[PDB]
Amino acid sequence: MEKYVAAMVLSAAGDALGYYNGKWEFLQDGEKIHRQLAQLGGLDALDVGRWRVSDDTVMHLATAEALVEAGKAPKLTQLYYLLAKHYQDCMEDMDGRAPGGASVHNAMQLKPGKPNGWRIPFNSHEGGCGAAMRAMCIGLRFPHHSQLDTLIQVSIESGRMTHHHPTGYLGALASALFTAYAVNSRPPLQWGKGLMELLPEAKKYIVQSGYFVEENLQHWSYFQTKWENYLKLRGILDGESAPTFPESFGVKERDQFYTSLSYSGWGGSSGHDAPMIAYDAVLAAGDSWKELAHRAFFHGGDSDSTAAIAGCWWGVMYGFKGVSPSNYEKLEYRNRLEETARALYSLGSKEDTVISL
Ligand SMILES: Nc1ncnc2c1ncn2[C@@H]1O[C@H](COP(=O)(O)OP(=O)(O)O)[C@@H](O)[C@H]1O
Ligand SMILES: [Cl-]
Ligand SMILES: [K+]
Ligand SMILES: [Mg+2]
Numbered sequence: 001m002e003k004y005v006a007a008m009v010l011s012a013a014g015d016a017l018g019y020y021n022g023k024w025e026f027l028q029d030g031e032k033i034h035r036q037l038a039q040l041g042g043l044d045a046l047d048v049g050r051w052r053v054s055d056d057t058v059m060h061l062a063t064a065e066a067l068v069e070a071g072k073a074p075k076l077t078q079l080y081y082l083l084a085k086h087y088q089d090c091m092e093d094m095d096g097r098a099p100g101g102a103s104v105h106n107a108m109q110l111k112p113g114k115p116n117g118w119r120i121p122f123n124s125h126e127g128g129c130g131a132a133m134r135a136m137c138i139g140l141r142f143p144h145h146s147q148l149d150t151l152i153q154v155s156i157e158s159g160r161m162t163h164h165h166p167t168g169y170l171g172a173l174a175s176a177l178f179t180a181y182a183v184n185s186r187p188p189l190q191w192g193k194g195l196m197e198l199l200p201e202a203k204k205y206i207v208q209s210g211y212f213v214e215e216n217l218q219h220w221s222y223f224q225t226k227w228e229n230y231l232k233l234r235g236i237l238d239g240e241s242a243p244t245f246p247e248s249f250g251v252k253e254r255d256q257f258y259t260s261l262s263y264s265g266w267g268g269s270s271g272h273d274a275p276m277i278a279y280d281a282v283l284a285a286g287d288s289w290k291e292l293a294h295r296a297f298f299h300g301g302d303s304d305s306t307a308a309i310a311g312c313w314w315g316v317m318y319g320f321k322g323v324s325p326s327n328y329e330k331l332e333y334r335n336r337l338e339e340t341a342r343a344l345y346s347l348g349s350k351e352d353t354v355i356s357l
Contacts, residue, residue, distance in 0.1 A: 001345060004140060006315030007179070008064065008341040010289075011136060012057040013328040014311025017046060018297040018304035019054045022098055030255040030300040043293050049330035055099040056308035059134035061336060062086035063158060067141045068343040075355040076153070083158055084112035103130035106162040118157075122164045122212035124219075127263060129274035129305045131159030132171030136312040139179025140344045144351040151176055152202055153356070163271065166206075166216055167263070170223040171271020173202055175309055178275065182316035183348070188282050192231040193239030199224055226272045230261065234283070243283045255300040267301030274302065278310035289314065289323045 019025045027033050040046060066082035087107040094104065102125070111117030135155050142151040155176040159169030177198065178191050186194070206216050231237040235244040246253065258267025258277055268277045281296035296310035297303060320328070328334065 001342070002319045003183075003316050004341040004345040004348070005338050006319045006341075007140060007182075007312050008060075008137070008315075008337040008344075009328050009331065009334060010315035010320070010323065011060060011308050011312035012053050012333065012337055013048060013323075013331055014293070014297055014307030015056045015060075015304045016048045016051040016053050016331060017043075017293065017327065018307035019051065019098075021050075021052055021096065024298065025054070025098060025302065025304045028300040030251045030298060033298045033300070033303075034251050034294070037298055043290055043327070044324040045326065046324070047326040047330065048328065048332075052096060053332045054097045054304050055094055055103060055130070056133040056305050057333065057337075058090050058093050058097060058099075059087065059103065059130070060137060060308060060312075061333065061340065062090040063134045064137040064140075064340045064344060067137060068340055068347065072347060073352045073354065076157075076357050077355075079154065079354070080118050080157060080161075081112050084110045084118035084161060087161055088112065100128050100130040102126045102128050102168070103162050110161060118161050119211065120161065120164050122215040124165065126160075126163040126165035127167035127222075127270050127272075128163060129168075129171060129269055129271055129302060131163040131168045132175045132271045132274045133305045133308050135159065135172035135175035136179040136309060137340075137344060138172075138176035139181070139183060140316075140341075141348050142176075143180040143183040143348050146351055147353070148180075148198075149201070149205075150354050151180060152198065152205055156202060156205060159271070164212065165271075166220050167223045168271040170199070170202065171275055173198070174271075174275040174279075175312075178279065178313055179316060182313045185317070188279070188313075188317075189236055189242055190239040191279065192227065192234075192236055195227065196224075196231070196237070223272050226261070227276065230276055230280075234280070236283075245284060251294075251299070254295065258299055258301045262301065267299070268306040269302035274305050275309050277301065277306040278313065281306070281310050282313055285314070287318055287321065289318070289321075289327075 070079040159172030285292035297307040
C-alpha cells in the first residue's frame with residue numbers, strides 16, 4: 001500500500017520541489033539553486049503547501065486516472081479513449097504550470113471518440129520529456145512479467161498521443177518500465193540493461209503498428225545510442241556491476257554533465273535524458289531522499305521533470321522513509337494522488353490481461 005501511495009505522492013512532491021513555482025525549474029545555475037535551498041533551511045525545512053505542482057504531475061495524474069477508469073482486463077481501445085480524454089481535459093489545469101509545447105499543443109488537437117482519434121503524425125521536434133514525465137504509473141498498473149507487451153504498447157501509445165518521435169515515446173517506455181522494475185524490487189543497477197534488451201521489442205511494436213514506420217526507424221538510433229553511451233560511462237551496460245561515478249561530481253560538475261546528456265542544451269528536457277538523469281540520481285542516492293533531491297530535483301536543467309520521474313521510482317522502493325513530512329503533507333492534489341495510488345495498487349497487484357487493438 002504505502003509504496004504505491006509514496007510513488008504517486010513523492011513523484012508530485014519532487015515535481016513541486018524542483019519547480020518552486022517556476023523559480024527553480026527555469027534557473028539554469030544549479031549552484032544558485034543549492035544556495036537558495038540552504039537559505040530556505042535545507043530540504044527538510046521545505047514546506048510544499050504553497051509550492052504548486054507543474055504540468056508533470058497534472059499529466060501523470062491524468063495517465064493514472066485513465067488507467068484506474070479503464071479498470072480490470074481493459075480493452076486498449078477504451079484505455080486509449082480515456083487517456084486521450086484525460087490528456088485533453090487536463091490542459092485546462094495548466095495555469096502557472098509552465099506546460100511543455102508538444103504536450104499542450106497535441107493534447108488539444110486530440111479527437112477522442114474518433115477511431116484512432118488519439119493518433120498524431122510523426123514530427124521531428126517531438127522529442128521532449130512530456131511523454132516520459134507522465135508514464136511512470138503505467139508500470140504501477142502493469143508490473144508483472146506477463147504484462148510486459150502491454151506495458152510496452154501502452155507506454156508507447158500514451159507517449160505518441162503528444163510525442164510522435166522515438167526519443168519522446170521511448171522516454172515513456174523507460175519511465176513505465178523502471179517503475180515496474182522498482183515494484184518488483186529489481187536492483188536499480190540492472191535497469192538500464194533491461195531497457196536496452198527491450199528496445200528491439202518496442203521496435204517490433206512500432207513496425208507492426210504501421211504508422212510512420214520509415215520516419216520512426218530513421219530516428220531510432222538517437223535514444224539507443226545515448227543510453228548505451230551513458231550505461232557504458234557508468235560501467236553498467238550489462239546490469240552486472242555497481243555503477244562508477246566520476247571523482248569530482250559536485251553541483252557544478254553535474255550541471256555540466258546534464259547539459260552534455262542533453263539534445264539542445266537543457267538537460268533532462270527530452271525523452272532520453274529526463275529518465276536518464278532520474279536514473280543516475282536513483283543509482284547514487286540509494287535510500288537517501290536528500291541525495292536523490294540534490295541530484296534529481298535541484299540542478300540547472302529541466303529539474304521538475306527529472307524530479308517527477310526520480311521521485312516516483314524512489315517512493316516505490318522506499319516509501320516515505322526519511323522524508324520530512326513538510327515535503328508532502330500539504331502537497332497540491334495529495335488526496336487525489338493517494339486515492340489514485342490505492343486504486344492502481346488494487347489493479348496492479350493482481351495480474352490481468354488486456355484486449356489488444
Ligand atoms: N528530436 C528531438 N530530440 C530530443 N529532444 C528534442 C527533440 N525535439 C525537441 N526536443 C527537446 O524538447 C524540449 C522542449 O520540449 P517541450 O517544449 O518542453 O515539449 P514537451 O515539454 O511537451 O516535451 C527542448 O528542450 C528540446 O531539447
Ligand atoms: Cl538539503
Ligand atoms: K533548473
Ligand atoms: Mg513541469
